[PDB]
Design a binder for this molecule. Structure first.
Ligand SMILES: O=C(O)c1cc(SCCc2ccccc2)ccc1NS(=O)(=O)N1CCN(Cc2ccc(F)cc2)CC1
Length: 150
């Protein structure tokens, strides 16, 4: 699943950078240029989204009450329930990923770094399984890079 593979590379690298500050030096494989451009886009748009939505993000994080792996595993059902309905737009997708980065920072703060990769996998899974049709129409990560280009 090329779209899952590419989406996971971008989302897991962003969530790891945000939580730990470390940069992945490993090559990204197929559609690497677009993946690197999408990750660069997330660094700029994602930082500002977390600052802009800080109050609601703090509130949503507190209600989810994530403290371990078992709490992370139960997030997939929550994301599927909220993200499946309503109109999709790039704003909604970047804010889903930016909230994932906000939760990843919380996971590092509580010394649960081992939960960051399962969280990135769970976000990617919900994005691709619920929005593949819309992502095909919008040209996937090429569409994402173009939409937020400045
Ligand atoms: O786009 C929507 O339909 C939307 C719906 C709501 S109604 C309340 C649902 C809720 C969520 C969390 C805790 C409690 C309740 C609130 C905000 C919304 N937009 S969003 O762009 O900010 N957003 C951020 C939160 N994503 C879910 C998520 C959960 C864990 C995670 F690691 C990453 C993402 C959904 C998309």
């Amino acid at each position: 699943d090329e779209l899952y593979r590419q989406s996971l590379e971008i989302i897991s690298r962003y969530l790891r950078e945000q939580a730990t500050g470390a940069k992945d030096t490993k090559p990204m494989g197929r559609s690497g240029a677009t993946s690197r451009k999408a990750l660069e886009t997330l660094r700029r748009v994602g930082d500002g989204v977390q600052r802009n939505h800080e109050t609601a993000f703090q509130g949503m994080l507190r209600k989810l009450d994530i403290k371990n792996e078992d709490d992370v595993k139960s997030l997939s059902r929550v994301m599927i329930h909220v993200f499946s309905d309503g109109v999709t737009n790039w704003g909604r997708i970047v804010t889903l990923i930016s909230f994932g980065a906000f939760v990843a920072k919380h996971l590092k703060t509580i010394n649960q770094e081992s939960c960051i990769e399962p969280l990135a996998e769970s976000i990617t899974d919900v994005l691709v399984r619920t929005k593949r049709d819309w992502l095909v129409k919008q040209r996937g990560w090429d569409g994402f890079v173009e939409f937020f280009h400045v």
